[PDB]
Design a protein around this ligand. Structure first.
Ligand SMILES: CCCCCCCCCCCCCCCCCC(=O)OC[C@H](COP(=O)([O-])OCC(O)COP(=O)([O-])OC[C@@H](COC(=O)CCCCCCCCCCCCCCCCC)OC(=O)CCCCCCCCCCCCCCCCC)OC(=O)CCCCCCCCCCCCCCCCC
Ligand SMILES: CCCCCCCCCCCCCCCCCC(=O)OC[C@H](COP(=O)([O-])OCC(O)COP(=O)([O-])OC[C@@H](COC(=O)CCCCCCCCCCCCCCCCC)OC(=O)CCCCCCCCCCCCCCCCC)OC(=O)CCCCCCCCCCCCCCCCC
Ligand SMILES: COC1=C(OC)C(=O)C(C/C=C(\C)CC/C=C(\C)CC/C=C(\C)CC/C=C(\C)CC/C=C(/C)CC/C=C(/C)CC/C=C(\C)CC/C=C(\C)CC/C=C(\C)CCC=C(C)C)=C(C)C1=O
Ligand SMILES: CCCCCCCCCCCCCCCCCC(=O)OC[C@H](COP(=O)([O-])OCC[N+](C)(C)C)OC(=O)CCCCCCCCCCCCCCCCC
Ligand SMILES: CCCCCCCCCCCCCCCCCC(=O)OC[C@H](COP(=O)([O-])OCC[N+](C)(C)C)OC(=O)CCCCCCCCCCCCCCCCC
Ligand code: SF4
Lengths: 98, 155, 83, 70, 318, 59, 97, 96, 175, 46, 59, 115, 99
């Protein structure tokens, strides 16, 4: 079970850890999400190029296709939190707690 | 010899500075209009290597053209501070030179020299664009006579 | 005519870029079905050999398959040479 | 009266000339006069590698024809 | 001697960029009844060297509110990419014969905006941030049409390799086949290079100097390097794409001369339009494209998608 | 707003001191005042160009 | 036809200025190569030419002297090197040299 | 004009592809001989290299089946020199 | 040396990942993702794929430019942070960098690490396959079959993109 | 933990606007160099 | 525009009060009314359509 | 071999030019010289506070538009298939859906900038 | 599939990409086409619970061909032992193995 796969999997692991931990902002978490997407693309591309699964090379393209759509929707959510909140931080997003 | 080498380096650097004097768009009063007419086709600053450029960060010579008043003097001094060295100040017109018509007013600086060190004094009210071109050429010769690396060699 | 012609003329007056884009799009949509060369294009894409024509075992019967590339029986693309 | 403009392009033309020739000449010099063989697909690269192998001197541009075979 | 080729694709390009300033200040000045630079030596042939010397000996102040690291990495990014995007051009024989040269150049052109981005943000100025955002909007709007027009034009090429364009335009210029797109393409080359009448990132009239406002001496000269190298490379790419030229395999010098002349003519038209128009107003140059360029280029994309099929003229991929 | 000159002439207001209250010998020369239409920048620019032409006539 | 004559008079440009050496002398000093009738010369050495065919503004001109009053003026020159008597004629304030 | 030129280019590409087809069997024969020879060389080297090893019966297959497997490029050039592996693996991808 | 290439590029990929996963200012996180994406495109290039790497390049530069344009607009602060300014971001950067350091340390000596999956790290040149692509790049024919084979994928992707524009419209409507 | 509003809408918060205010003034080529235009603007719309 | 002077004498050889009515003053007073919703570039156009001169404005 | 050698040449040449630009000219720096430039007078104080961008909708839909060109770009190789009818229908499907997206944005304010 | 509408309508939507042995464009074979074909033809209709016990060595060969380290571990230990014993002079490579 070869080496480059280890580096891409480990990069995805740190990006998953980074997403699941917030510090201040909303953009940073979204960036960490798209980094997870990047690691997924690189991994899948490596897998299918190595296996000569020619009909499956469209799969990373569709990955990126829905990647950009989710990034867009998340940053529109950030637009609205900024419009109703002035800023984008998450610790002040607490109105739903009670 | 080292003196000859530093001499030639002085000539090269001084030639570059004098042949690409980039002035600033700091017209203040009627003295700016002549400042435009020498930029007009007849006299055409461009052929002498001088091309107008705002944003003091990328300019060398300031032609203070027009009356320098009290309300503007802090802005002029600050803007002169933004200029990275080497920098030169050309004073156009009697108002920017020593006060001009309104030398005895209450809100006029009695000479631009009181705020920045003026390098070339161009007289006129307003100076003819030929006279301002002559002042710029005089500043050019001034840069030509600089002895920076010579003084460094004789530190 | 009437309302339709007036609308076309007003659209040509006001927004000619939209009129041109819609006309080009409609043309590019509906012409390719009508044009007879489309099939030709497909055949050309079928004519271009990328993989080897792997030979098949001659167990006798099949007459159509050539026994040599120069042999006359088999598919030919003289049409492409002429066209 | 724009002929004074013309030198500016002229030398500049020379500037834009210098790479286009040089690369070509370099491609001729480093590949034995002939054009640099371009491998846009694996088949061309296989041909180039077999040329390097057959040449015996490990340069693909060195070509052998009828004299090499018996 | 691959190093020799690399140096021969850099120093001549930098010299051409230097003389681009002189030919601009002369052609423009002659548009405006002036004479342009005339004093330094014969016909101003030393002005590029003179101001080159000044800009690298003038004091390169660093603002107190800057971000040092990006303030420095931005000029390097700009010049490095402007120089790198010259390597896949099929000047007789391309230096780097890439199978996806068009996509590569699109990628590096899209990267070049990041130099403007980081330089504007790191400078800590109102004008610089304004110019950075105008650059954001301009380059995204024009990049969409850049990609679509490139696809539409190259549909007749058969692939993305730059060299085959010469084979494509063997008997006729490609502009006779896609003259509408070419017009749009030219405008895009005007805007991606951030030139007139779309030079709103600098906006000398309204933004003093835009994203170069806090850039002085060497870094400023370097951003100018990137801008003018991009101008010449874009005109070269336009010449390669549409105005093809004859290429004798035995004498590539003929194709070199023809290509260089076409690039020179396209650049001269760049300075021509720079001195014959007012300047666009931000949203207009956006509303120009998202409402007039984008629909037309989509329609032309469908037209050029269908065109080889309806006429049985699909170009080969090899 | 106290506007005068072009900014009146550029917004339909038919007023010009050279004609309404002639001074010097302006009651002798013949010229036309370029009344504006919309009051925008373009209309005022066109008014200024036409004033240039009419002043040429007066010269 | 006019192309040939145009190429030709460019050689009268170098012929009038004392050959090639004087041609580059005036080209590098006065930045012009145009010829004109020698209207006169002053005691300081400045040569004073006129050509009525040129448009108003360049019909008269000076090549400044190489040396004046113990100062090398081969490379650096200025407008104050004009003697007062000739400053009238040079600035088109009179037609009498 | 583009239609006519593209049709001619299609004919030329067909001609070139059929030339490649005519030439492919020799390349296939030479390639299979080269890979078999390389595998033989690696096996002979492994015989000497795996001698004092506890248990490394040489020439052993990994797949339980007996049908031949296209050998991985690592097991075709493992003992070869550095330039050989660099040119074999990153050869076409790096040739620009 | 040029022996590994892919190894070093993967390490730069991970370092770029650490850069933006440490929650710095979103501009700096964008820069980190930029370098990570560039070196990832390099890895994909070195692994016999050209179109995919350049597609990552172009698409991610577009996305990250829009992220910047929003960052300095909406998600900014009077005091932007650096990877060394705050102790929290410094701690995250330190944790990530020393972690990957010790992972690659345990990797490239033993070359038999078990972590999560068995990782026999001899060399990425090994796993390459001896093949012949003829006169067609496999990846090009692969992603070119989307319009011929994957019609269903065409339909679903187009529908998703159109309705994505619709939702980007509805979410940002603001009453 | 006061109960959520009956209309389930939080009251609109206070103003959070931070519109730019730059000196379109001296040394600017458009401002003739002797103007000081202090413009309170939101982004580009003044 | 309508450039005027309110000259107030006193019977001596020097004026007592010379007030200068300046069209530029009134035009610049109305700059804000003009630039409503217009962007910064429109403001650049507007302060130009007045032909604003601050020698006359500042008196 | 060639591409990274190139890239290295450009980056080191640029970094060098930066080095000579930043170490040779003998700078003399003081506080007011590096003060931020605000058309003369001292800035009000900001340069990092939120800067409203009214094309935020336009900016974000650029992301989807540029995303679709990833689907679009395989066309030069997609034309050379044996199923030209399906390829043509799908390519026109992508282009028609992009036209519909652009038209929906145009009609429902969309491309028009906020105020 | 949960609600397999594809078999009901006889319409192909995703089955073309499910496996590596399907009809690829231009008849390009997969890297492990033979192993996948053998494994699939082995456990077809037999049952997804009988497949693990019955078609085991076929799937093992296929997964090896996919990842290849009952072969690459062989190579790694070969190279390790070679570099080990060559260090102190037990073995020298033959000339054809270095040029
Ligand atoms: C496109 C360029 C095509 C090649 C050059 C053609 C050209 O300019 O021929 C000269 C000739 C005159 O020059 P011009 O550009 O008309 O400007 C003349 C002015 O009236 C100004 O004329 P003038 O009043 O100065 O009087 C005559 C003048 C006439 O001007 C000349 O003699 C200059 C021509 C070169 C000598 O002679 C001089 O001024 C001599 C000064 C020469 C300075 C160096 C010029 C270098 C040119 C480029 C060289 C190659 C690089 O050209 C024409 O009349 C047009 C010919 C167009 C041919 C196009 C072929 C494609
Ligand atoms: C990703 C890795 C990021 C590593 C990092 O901490 O970067 C900080 C670096 C500098 O942050 P800054 O906000 O400019 O603050 C610099 C001084 O703290 C504030 O300005 P300064 O004037 O103090 O700058 C000089 C200062 C900091 O050094 C520099 O400014 C030199 C250039 C950065 C060196 C690190 O020098 C020192 O601290 C002593 C150096 C011995 O920020 C970056 O974004 C650099 C990333 C480079 C990534 C690789 C690019 C290829
Ligand atoms: C109504 O009342 C008003 C007032 O009322 C009082 C006013 O006051 C004012 C205000 C007054 C004014 C604005 C004043 C009036 C101003 C004007 C009219 C403006 C006039 C302007 C002009 C005449 C000039 C216009 C400019 C033009 C046409 C062109 C400019 C273009 C250029 C390119 C300029 C040159 C600049 C640069 C940077 C280029 C030079 C650089 C290089 C060549 C670099 C080369 C380097 C190399 C070769 C390096 C090589 C390296 C190598 C080979 C290797 C390196 C490697 C290594 C390792 C070392 C106004 C407006 C007003 O309205
Ligand atoms: C390619 C370009 C080749 C030529 C490069 C020349 C660079 C010259 C930079 C300026 C001179 C600096 C120098 O060498 O010594 C500074 C010397 C130092 O000697 P100094 O003791 O007079 O110091 C100058 C005064 N202070 C310290 C206040 C700045 O000064 C000068 O040259 C200017 C006087
Ligand atoms: C990084 C380092 C790179 C180093 C590269 C090596 C060369 C760099 C410096 C090159 C110029 C050095 C200075 C000598 C020339 C000079 O500037 O002279 C000014 C001086 C200025 O003298 P001046 O000051 O009297 O001129 C102005 C005043 N008027 C107009 C009244 C005369 O002129 C000369 O020396 C005359 C030279 C005439 C010929 C010039 C060259 C013509 C051919 C150019 C071909 C294209 C080249 C590219
Ligand atoms: S010196 Fe004369 S012309 Fe110049 S600003 Fe003063 S009054 Fe006006």
């Amino acid at each position: 079970m070869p080496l480059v796969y280890m580096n891409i999997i480990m990069a995805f692991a740190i990006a998953l850890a980074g997403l699941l931990m917030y510090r201040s902002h909303l953009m940073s978490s979204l960036l960490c999400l798209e980094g997870m997407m990047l690691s997924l693309f690189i991994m899948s591309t490596l897998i299918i190029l190595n296996t000569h699964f020619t009909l499956a090379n469209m799969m990373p393209i569709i990955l990126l296709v829905f990647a950009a759509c989710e990034a867009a929707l998340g940053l529109s959510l950030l637009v609205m939190v900024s419009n109703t909140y002035g800023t984008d931080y998450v610790q002040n997003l607490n109105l739903l707690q009670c | 010899r080292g003196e000859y080498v530093v001499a030639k380096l002085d000539d090269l650097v001084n030639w570059a500075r004098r042949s690409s004097l980039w002035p600033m768009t700091f017209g203040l009063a009627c003295c700016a209009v002549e400042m435009m007419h020498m930029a007009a086709p007849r006299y055409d600053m461009d052929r002498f290597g001088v091309v107008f450029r705002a944003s003091p960060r990328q300019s060398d010579v300031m032609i203070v053209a027009g009356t320098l008043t009290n309300k503007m003097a802090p802005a002029l001094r600050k803007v002169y501070d933004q200029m990275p060295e080497p920098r030169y100040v050309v004073s156009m017109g009697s108002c920017a030179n020593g006060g001009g018509y309104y030398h005895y007013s209450y809100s006029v600086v009695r000479g631009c020299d009181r705020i920045v060190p003026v390098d070339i004094y161009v007289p006129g009210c307003p100076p003819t664009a030929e006279a301002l071109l002559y002042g710029i050429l005089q500043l050019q010769r001034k840069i030509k006579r600089e002895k920076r690396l010579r003084i460094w060699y004789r530190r | 005519a009437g309302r339709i012609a007036s609308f076309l003329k007003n659209a040509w007056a006001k927004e000619p870029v939209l009129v041109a884009s819609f006309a080009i799009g409609g043309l590019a949509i509906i012409l390719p079905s009508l044009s007879p060369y489309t099939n030709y294009a497909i055949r050309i894409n079928r004519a271009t050999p990328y993989n080897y024509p792997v030979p098949l075992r001659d167990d006798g019967n099949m007459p159509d398959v050539p026994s040599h590339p120069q042999d006359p029986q088999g598919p030919s693309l003289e049409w492409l040479k002429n066209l | 009266m724009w002929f004074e403009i013309l030198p500016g392009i002229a030398v500049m033309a020379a500037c834009l000339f210098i790479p286009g020739m040089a690369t070509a000449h370099i491609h001729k010099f480093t590949n034995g006069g002939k054009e640099k063989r371009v491998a846009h697909f694996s088949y061309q690269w296989n041909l180039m590698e077999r040329d390097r192998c057959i040449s015996g001197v490990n340069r693909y541009h060195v070509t052998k024809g009828l004299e090499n075979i018996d | 001697m691959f190093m020799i080729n690399i140096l021969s694709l850099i120093i001549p390009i930098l010299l051409a960029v230097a003389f681009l300033t002189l030919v601009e200040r002369k052609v423009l000045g002659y548009m405006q009844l002036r004479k342009g630079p005339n004093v330094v030596g014969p016909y101003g042939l030393l002005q590029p060297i003179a101001d080159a010397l000044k800009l690298v000996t003038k004091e390169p102040l660093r603002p107190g509110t800057s971000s040092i690291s990006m303030f420095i990495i931005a000029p390097i990014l700009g010049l490095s990419l402007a120089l790198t995007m010259w390597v896949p051009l099929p000047m007789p024989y391309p230096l780097i014969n890439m199978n996806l040269g068009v996509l590569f150049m699109l990628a590096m052109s899209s990267l070049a905006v990041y130099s403007i981005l980081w330089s504007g943000w790191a400078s800590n100025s109102k004008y610089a941030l304004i110019g950075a955002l105008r650059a954001v909007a301009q380059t995204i709007s024009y990049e969409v049409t850049l990609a679509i027009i490139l696809l539409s034009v190259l549909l007749m090429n058969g692939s993305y390799t730059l060299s085959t364009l010469i084979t494509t335009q063997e008997h006729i210029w490609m502009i006779f086949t896609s003259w509408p797109l070419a017009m749009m393409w030219f405008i895009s080359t005007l805007a991606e290079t951030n030139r007139a009448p779309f030079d709103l990132t600098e906006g000398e009239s309204e933004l003093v100097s835009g994203f170069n406002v806090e850039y002085a001496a060497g870094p400023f000269a370097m951003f100018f390097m990137a801008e003018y190298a991009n101008i010449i490379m874009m005109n070269a790419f336009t010449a390669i794409l549409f105005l093809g030229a004859s290429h004798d395999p035995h004498t590539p010098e003929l194709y070199t001369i023809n290509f260089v002349l076409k690039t020179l003519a396209l650049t001269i038209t760049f300075l021509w339009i720079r001195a014959s128009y007012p300047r666009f107003r931000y949203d207009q140059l956006m509303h120009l494209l998202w409402k007039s360029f984008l629909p037309l280029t989509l329609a032309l994309c469908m037209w050029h998608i269908s065109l080889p099929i309806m006429t049985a003229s699909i170009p080969p991929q090899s | 707003y106290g506007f005068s000159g072009v900014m009146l002439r550029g917004s339909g207001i038919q007023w010009d001191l050279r004609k309404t209250q002639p001074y010097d010998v302006y009651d002798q020369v013949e010229f036309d005042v370029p009344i504006g239409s919309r009051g925008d920048c373009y209309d005022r620019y066109l008014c200024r160009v036409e004033e240039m032409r009419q002043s040429l006539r007066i010269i | 036809m006019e192309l040939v004559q145009v190429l030709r008079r460019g050689l009268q440009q170098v012929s009038g200025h004392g050959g090639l050496r004087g041609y580059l002398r005036v080209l590098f000093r006065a930045n012009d190569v145009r010829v004109g009738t020698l209207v006169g010369e002053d005691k300081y050495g400045n040569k004073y030419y006129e050509d009525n065919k040129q448009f108003f503004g360049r019909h008269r001109w000076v090549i400044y002297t190489t040396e004046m009053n113990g100062r090398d003026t081969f490379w650096d020159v200025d407008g104050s090197m004009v003697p007062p008597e000739w400053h009238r004629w040079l600035h088109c304030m009179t037609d009498d040299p | 004009s583009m239609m006519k030129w593209n049709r001619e280019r299609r004919r030329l590409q067909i001609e070139d592809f059929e030339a490649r087809i005519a030439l492919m069997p020799l390349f296939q024969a030479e390639k299979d001989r080269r890979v078999l020879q390389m595998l033989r060389e690696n096996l002979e080297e492994e015989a000497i290299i795996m001698k004092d090893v506890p248990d490394w019966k040489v020439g052993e297959s990994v797949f339980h089946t007996t049908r031949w497997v296209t050998p991985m490029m690592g097991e075709l050039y493992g003992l070869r020199t550095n330039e050989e592996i660099l040119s074999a693996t990153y050869g076409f991808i790096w040739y620009t | 040396m040029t022996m590994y290439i892919a190894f070093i590029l993967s390490t730069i990929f991970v370092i770029g990942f650490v850069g933006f996963s440490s929650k710095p200012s979103p501009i700096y996180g964008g820069l980190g993702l930029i370098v990570s994406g560039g070196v990832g495109c390099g890895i994909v290039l070195n692994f016999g794929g050209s179109f995919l790497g350049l597609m990552v390049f172009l698409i991610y530069l577009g996305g990250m430019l829009v992220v910047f344009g929003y960052t300095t607009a909406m998600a900014t602060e009077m005091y932007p942070e650096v990877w060394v300014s705050n102790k929290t971001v410094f701690g995250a950067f330190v944790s990530g960098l020393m972690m990957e350091f010790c992972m690659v340390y345990y990797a490239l000596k033993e070359e038999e690490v078990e972590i999560i999956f068995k990782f026999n790290g001899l060399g990425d040149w090994v796993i390459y396959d001896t093949g012949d692509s003829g006169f067609f790049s496999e990846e090009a024919m692969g992603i070119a079959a989307l319009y011929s084979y994957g019609t269903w994928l065409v339909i679903v992707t187009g529908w998703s993109l159109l309705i994505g524009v619709v939702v980007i419209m509805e979410i940002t409507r603001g009453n | 933990w006061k109960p959520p509003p009956w209309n389930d809408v939080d009251p609109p918060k206070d103003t959070l606007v931070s519109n730019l205010t730059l000196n379109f003034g001296p040394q600017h080529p458009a401002a003739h160099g002797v103007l000081r235009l202090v413009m309170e603007l939101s982004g580009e719309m003044v | 525009g309508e450039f005027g002077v309110y000259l107030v004498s006193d019977g001596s050889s020097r004026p007592y009060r010379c007030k200068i009515k300046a069209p530029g003053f009134a035009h610049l007073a109305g700059l804000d009314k003009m630039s409503k919703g217009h962007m910064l570039a429109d403001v650049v156009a507007i302060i130009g359509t007045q032909d604003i001169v601050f020698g006359e404005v500042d008196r | 071999m060639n591409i990274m050698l190139t890239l290295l040449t450009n980056v080191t040449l640029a970094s060098l030019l930066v080095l000579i630009a930043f170490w040779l000219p003998q700078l003399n720096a003081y506080s007011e010289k590096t003060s931020p430039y605000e058309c003369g007078f001292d800035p009000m104080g900001s340069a990092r506070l939120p800067f409203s961008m009214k094309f935020f909708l336009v900016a974000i839909t650029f992301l989807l538009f540029d995303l679709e060109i990833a689907l679009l770009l395989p066309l030069p190789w997609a034309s050379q298939t044996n199923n030209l009818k399906t390829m043509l229908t799908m390519a026109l499907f992508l282009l028609i859906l992009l036209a519909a997206s652009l038209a929906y944005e145009w009609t429902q304010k969309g491309l028009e900038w906020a105020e | 599939p949960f609600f397999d509408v594809q078999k009901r309508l006889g319409l192909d939507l995703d089955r073309w990409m499910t496996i590596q042995s399907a009809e690829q464009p231009h008849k390009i074979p997969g890297r492990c086409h033979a192993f996948e074909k053998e494994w699939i033809e082995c456990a077809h209709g037999i049952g997804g619970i009988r497949a693990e016990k019955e078609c085991k060595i076929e799937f093992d060969d296929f997964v090896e061909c996919l990842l290849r380290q009952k072969t690459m571990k062989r190579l790694s230990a070969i190279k390790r032992q070679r570099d080990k014993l060559i260090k102190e002079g037990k073995y020298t490579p033959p000339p054809h193995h270095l040029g």
